[PDB]
Amino acid sequence: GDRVADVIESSIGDSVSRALTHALPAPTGQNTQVSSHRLDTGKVPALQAAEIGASSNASDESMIETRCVLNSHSTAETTLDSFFSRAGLVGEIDLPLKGTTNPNGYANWDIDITGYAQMRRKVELFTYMRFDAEFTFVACTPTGEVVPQLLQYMFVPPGAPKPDSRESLAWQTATNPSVFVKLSDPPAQVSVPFMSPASAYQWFYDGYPTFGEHKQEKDLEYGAMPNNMMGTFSVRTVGTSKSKYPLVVRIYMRMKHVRAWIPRPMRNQNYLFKANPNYAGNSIKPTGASRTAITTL
Amino acid sequence: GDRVADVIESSIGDSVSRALTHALPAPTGQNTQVSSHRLDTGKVPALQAAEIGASSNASDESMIETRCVLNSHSTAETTLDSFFSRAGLVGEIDLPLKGTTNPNGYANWDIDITGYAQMRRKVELFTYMRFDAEFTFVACTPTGEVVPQLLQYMFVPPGAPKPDSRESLAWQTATNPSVFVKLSDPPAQVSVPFMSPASAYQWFYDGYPTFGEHKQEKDLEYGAMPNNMMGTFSVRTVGTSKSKYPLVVRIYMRMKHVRAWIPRPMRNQNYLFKANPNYAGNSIKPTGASRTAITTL
Amino acid sequence: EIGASSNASDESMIETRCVLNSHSTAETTLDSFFSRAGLVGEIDLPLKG
Amino acid sequence: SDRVAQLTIGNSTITTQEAANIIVGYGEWPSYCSDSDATAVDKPTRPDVSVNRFYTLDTKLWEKSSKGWYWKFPDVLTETGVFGQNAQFHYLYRSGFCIHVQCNASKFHQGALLVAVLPEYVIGTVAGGTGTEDTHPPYKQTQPGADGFELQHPYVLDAGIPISQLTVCPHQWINLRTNNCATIIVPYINALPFDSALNHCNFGLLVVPISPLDYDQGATPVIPITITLAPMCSEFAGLRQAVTQ
Amino acid sequence: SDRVAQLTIGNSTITTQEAANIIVGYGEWPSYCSDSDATAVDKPTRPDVSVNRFYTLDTKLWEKSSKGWYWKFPDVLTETGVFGQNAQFHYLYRSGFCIHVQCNASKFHQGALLVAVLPEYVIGTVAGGTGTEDTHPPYKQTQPGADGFELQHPYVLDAGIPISQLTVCPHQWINLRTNNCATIIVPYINALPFDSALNHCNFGLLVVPISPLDYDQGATPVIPITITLAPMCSEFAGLRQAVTQ
Amino acid sequence: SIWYQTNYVVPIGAPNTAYIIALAAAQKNFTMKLCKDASDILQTGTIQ
Amino acid sequence: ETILEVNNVPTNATSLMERLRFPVSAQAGKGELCAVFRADPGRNGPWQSTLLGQLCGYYTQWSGSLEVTFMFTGSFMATGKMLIAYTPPGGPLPKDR
Numbered sequence A, B: 001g002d003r004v005a006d007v008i009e010s011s012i013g014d015s016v017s018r019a020l021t022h023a024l025p026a027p028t029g030q031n032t033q034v035s036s037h038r039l040d041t042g043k044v045p046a047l048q049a050a051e052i053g054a055s056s057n058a059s060d061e062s063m064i065e066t067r068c069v070l071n072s073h074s075t076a077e078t079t080l081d082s083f084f085s086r087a088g089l090v091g092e093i094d095l096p097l098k099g100t101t102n103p104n105g106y107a108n109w110d111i112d113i114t115g116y117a118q119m120r121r122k123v124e125l126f127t128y129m130r131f132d133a134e135f136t137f138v139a140c141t142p143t144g145e146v147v148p149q150l151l152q153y154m155f156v157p158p159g160a161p162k163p164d165s166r167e168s169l170a171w172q173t174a175t176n177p178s179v180f181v182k183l184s185d186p187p188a189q190v191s192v193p194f195m196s197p198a199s200a201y202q203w204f205y206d207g208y209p210t211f212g213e214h215k216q217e218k219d220l221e222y223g224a225m226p227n228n229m230m231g232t233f234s235v236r237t238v239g240t241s242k243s244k245y246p247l248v249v250r251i252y253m254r255m256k257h258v259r260a261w262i263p264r265p266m267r268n269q270n271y272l273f274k275a276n277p278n279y280a281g282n283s284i285k286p287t288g289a290s291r292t293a294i295t296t297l
Numbered sequence C: 001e002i003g004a005s006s007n008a009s010d011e012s013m014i015e016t017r018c019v020l021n022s023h024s025t026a027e028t029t030l031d032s033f034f035s036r037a038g039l040v041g042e043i044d045l046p047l048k049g
Numbered sequence D, E: 001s002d003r004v005a006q007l008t009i010g011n012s013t014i015t016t017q018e019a020a021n022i023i024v025g026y027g028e029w030p031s032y033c034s035d036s037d038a039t040a041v042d043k044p045t046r047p048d049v050s051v052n053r054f055y056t057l058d059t060k061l062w063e064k065s066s067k068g069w070y071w072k073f074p075d076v077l078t079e080t081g082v083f084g085q086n087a088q089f090h091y092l093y094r095s096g097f098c099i100h101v102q103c104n105a106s107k108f109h110q111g112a113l114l115v116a117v118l119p120e121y122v123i124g125t126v127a128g129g130t131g132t133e134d135t136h137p138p139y140k141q142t143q144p145g146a147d148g149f150e151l152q153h154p155y156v157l158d159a160g161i162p163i164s165q166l167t168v169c170p171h172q173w174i175n176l177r178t179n180n181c182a183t184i185i186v187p188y189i190n191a192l193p194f195d196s197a198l199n200h201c202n203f204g205l206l207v208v209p210i211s212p213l214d215y216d217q218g219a220t221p222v223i224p225i226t227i228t229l230a231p232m233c234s235e236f237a238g239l240r241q242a243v244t245q
Numbered sequence F: 001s002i003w004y005q006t007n008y009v010v011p012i013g014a015p016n017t018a019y020i021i022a023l024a025a026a027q028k029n030f031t032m033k034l035c036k037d038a039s040d041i042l043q044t045g046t047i048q
Numbered sequence G: 001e002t003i004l005e006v007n008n009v010p011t012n013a014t015s016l017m018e019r020l021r022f023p024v025s026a027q028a029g030k031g032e033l034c035a036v037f038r039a040d041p042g043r044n045g046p047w048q049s050t051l052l053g054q055l056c057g058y059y060t061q062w063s064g065s066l067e068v069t070f071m072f073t074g075s076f077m078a079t080g081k082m083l084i085a086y087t088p089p090g091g092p093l094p095k096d097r
């Protein structure tokens, strides 16, 4: 029981997030209302105070004499699902015959979509994102040819044994999900749920994954978010003997059922490395085009 | 406002001191009830478990066959006011003529009643005590003679100027309380209220009055409780010339309207110093009489 | 020694807060655990063998 | 009546007579974690006044050539007062913040600072200049503590993103002819209900001059920028011994 | 059903299968300070679980010749955990305590410890032996910290009072043939509503063998006495920088 | 971590060393998700 | 509940059964350390001996509270008090009690 007044009257524990704003339906662009001349003292829409941190509240109607316009222009194409639910390339896997990289007929790809700039720049507009996804696998030879070859794709979550050869016992796939498909078949396609241990994936994590001294050698771990590490994607030609053909698997991802939070400035310098915002210090370029003088076009 | 459950259901702030016991009226000693023989299993009043920390609950009635006795013996003389409201000596002040101590005709006595063992031992039975008091001042020459001499007693609270001579300006006593009385008059007597800044006086204070390092030189301050320091009692012969007679003022204190808390073991070693429990290590004596053998009287 | 597992819970061993647990138990059903195709046999049909 | 303000929390009070309103990040006030969002089962500790109060941590000097600085939260406070102690003894922490950046001059000085809060402010390096070396920033640059850290390339926020768009984050400006402070309230932002105050900085505070400081010879040349902040609705859990990192 | 017990507070739990009930000092449970008894005006901080929990501070070895020891409260805890930090950062403190002294042996060992709580346990010195020197005990003897201090003259409790009457204070006995622990709950005792955790020890805990430890050659000879205690209803006020004394 | 709070005490005639057996399990709020293959595969060559 | 091999040190076939139990014995009263182990149920170590640990291996993620019940198998005449502690993340192996 509580008896001293400061305890009774305290707000310690209020779990309700007091919100100053709320969403309104806006299926179309706003309309324009008729306006006329205003010759007044006291009323001054045009004057603002940007220091406050808010954007100007002045509208067309108050700055010029406007007509009435019934705007039926839709806002549907700018929803998160509209912007993001379009398949883009997020991974390429090579399976050569005579090669330096994967001459053994299998390959392991750590799932990380930050290797391609188009897709990456788009998702990095937000800090946190939660979504489901549709993955499509397009396979062919390096010339774009289709050959009668059978492949196995397996999803290996963190902790499951990664295959170490085309004949690894792990390909028994008694629990992991695998897809068996021919290059001659249409691209394989599957749905993936939101799998992070967190409520969202986060393209930016200002911190370290572990405790301890963060000495120079363990600085490559700054920014590493295990909550974003979903595992490995493994592929192999299905046989006990080497395949007769060199292959390429291109991975496309289409997000769906998207939610995003905390928008941020968009990347303006070329990307250099996966999941790390390093930029070339000697080649810092302006965000856009430049001109010779401010008084000339 | 509070919304998370642990906050709603918490007892943080309960100001009510849950008490397991309560006082009952007991104006007389308890009576004795008739009892008879009990030849039973399971019932065992005589057996106790002192380890628990409680005193035995066994009574006469359950240990022997008793008669009925209507006890009208009163408990009134053992109340705190009965025990303490009896005037005892707490201070002696000398005002000699030709002397080493106070040859100047005035004297300052820091109010501390721990200089006399009878009174001291009684109040030290408790840790905290709150009370009002009646002070009586008995003055005479060293032979017990009464002379036609006028005195001034002044109460000087902490912060008021202590007189430094029989002619100090402080004797103007425009605000402090003073008593002017002749030795030929009956003893002066006044009532004093409870004056501590605390809710009670405390005969024991396990601590230091100030912060800082408590180095050897400031160890004489261990146990010093300013909350018990009520000031100075000053006395002077009222004149500009030395008095013709040597005097002694004995101070008696009678407590009244007493409240006490936390009883403690009673002093069993001789006292040595005022407000400090030091005892002579080489002369530690038993609490009481001793005998030659445990099997002999 | 009785043969049963401990009946002690978080609530009785430490001061706990209230937690509304909506974590699902669906993926640990027998059909969830077992209804996943795995390899159980390989048969060879060679030419010169 | 919008230019004047008083912020009182704990045993601390701030006053300003040249304010520009108050920004509440993403439109929401700090709040404690609900029983449905929570996952850890131990009863949290909510110290209240001993930790939710204003702490003045640092003063920088604004010079005609300053590039700008940043601080990381809750890093700036992990070693200060009762808040710090709690952050060290507990695995889990969560809180909001009221940030008040101060800077006054005279009606004859000029310049404008952009004060903004950027969640998950991951720092990048210049990659060996040529961009061929995959280097990483050192602990002292990612978690600079109370001293903060000076931006090497403000135009790209030392992270390859345009400062020109930083206004998409909760912010205010300190434009000397107008105001002498910025006040931003920030709720707890993260994809988890609680996290480590040591391993993870939820957001960074940036103070960057966009219109350079200027004044005539003879006017006071020392123009300090002081950072004061207060945790709000602090909660801690997962108690053990104190740890600094 | 009086011999068995579990004490759970904070993130800590104690069990015993050879208890002897529980003593609640002076018949009353610890409580927070009321708005009428209080005098300081600042809103207090009541950390709760982070400080009201069991802390195991020390272990002494009971030997056939031990004289007994004492600890001072809250001194024993001023440098431990979140409680200590709070005690150092605040001028004012107040709390109750649950004390659990542990000591087990075998059905073949014997001895009895008196475990008692004495408020305002002022220590005296032997006055130079002859009683002519007005000496005072050093800081390390008055506030011994977690290590406690050994009694020089247990019969007079190093203070000129009889240990034979110490049972007038809240206490229990650990009589080996009967129990292996003592549990005493103590409310806040003082003539003020709050006080300094550093300058004033509200009470002392005494553990003194009255019936000496004994056993036959061959039985385990190392018989430890461990002290575990938990603050209850802790409240702090008057916040400033941390101070150790 | 497990520590001696007091001491293991025994009288004359009883062993100076004894053992503790630890039994572990999950509480009722325990659940698992994202079904995967175990880290071990208990076969070396083909099973005949 | 299944048996947790806190004593996962002996490896020779003839001593495998010793992994199933660990000892306590008379000490010096210095609050000595008896044993330590990580609480991670799906990590290599003691938990691998438990059915929980094994089942855990078929799932990528888990959530929940765990419990370890310790049974003392000394003689009836043996007594003792042990302090068992759980140190949440970030706290290094405790150096002392």
Ligand SMILES: Nc1ncnc2c1ncn2[C@@H]1O[C@H](COP(=O)(O)O)[C@@H](O)[C@H]1O
Residues within 6 Å of the ligand: A024, A025, A026, A027, A028, A029, A030, A031
């Ligand atoms: N930010 C916006 N974008 C597009 N349409 C809007 C927006 N705000 C309001 N509207 C439209 O204007 C109407 C509300 O006008 P009002 O009540 O003045 O806010 C609604 O029926 C909406 O369809």
Ligand SMILES: Nc1ncnc2c1ncn2[C@@H]1O[C@H](COP(=O)(O)O)[C@@H](O)[C@H]1O
Residues within 6 Å of the ligand: B024, B025, B026, B027, B028, B029, B030, B031
């Ligand atoms: N501790 C005591 N000392 C003296 N008289 C007592 C005491 N307790 C109870 N009594 C008397 O006995 C009566 C109560 O008996 P009972 O109801 O059995 O507690 C009252 O009328 C009291 O006058």
Ligand SMILES: CCCCCCCCCCCCC/C=C\[C@H](O)[C@H](N)CO
Residues within 6 Å of the ligand: A111, A112, A113, A114, A133, A135, A153, A154, A155, A177, A178, A179, A190, A192, A201, A202, A203, A228, A229, A230, A233, A275
């Ligand atoms: C049968 C094959 C199925 C293939 C399974 C694909 C699972 C992919 C899950 C989507 C994960 C989203 C991307 C997450 C994190 C980022 O790529 C980086 N780690 C950021 O550091």
Ligand SMILES: CCCCCCCCCCCCC/C=C\[C@H](O)[C@H](N)CO
Residues within 6 Å of the ligand: B111, B112, B113, B114, B133, B135, B153, B154, B155, B177, B178, B179, B190, B192, B201, B202, B203, B228, B229, B230, B233, B275
């Ligand atoms: C006109 C003369 C009036 C005389 C005034 C007498 C005031 C005496 C107040 C009673 C104080 C009670 C005793 C208090 C403390 C103890 O003596 C010691 N300081 C304990 O350390």
Ligand SMILES: [Cl-]
Residues within 6 Å of the ligand: G040, G041, G042, G043
């Ligand atoms: Cl694990």
Ligand SMILES: [K+]
Residues within 6 Å of the ligand: A028, A029, A030, A031, A070, A071, A072
């Ligand atoms: K419209």
Ligand SMILES: [K+]
Residues within 6 Å of the ligand: B028, B029, B030, B031, B070, B071, B072
């Ligand atoms: K009677």
Ligand SMILES: [K+]
Residues within 6 Å of the ligand: C020, C021, C022
């Ligand atoms: K549920």
Ligand code: NA
Residues within 6 Å of the ligand: A044, A045, A046, A047, A048
């Ligand atoms: Na306007």
Ligand code: NA
Residues within 6 Å of the ligand: B044, B045, B046, B047, B048
């Ligand atoms: Na009885």
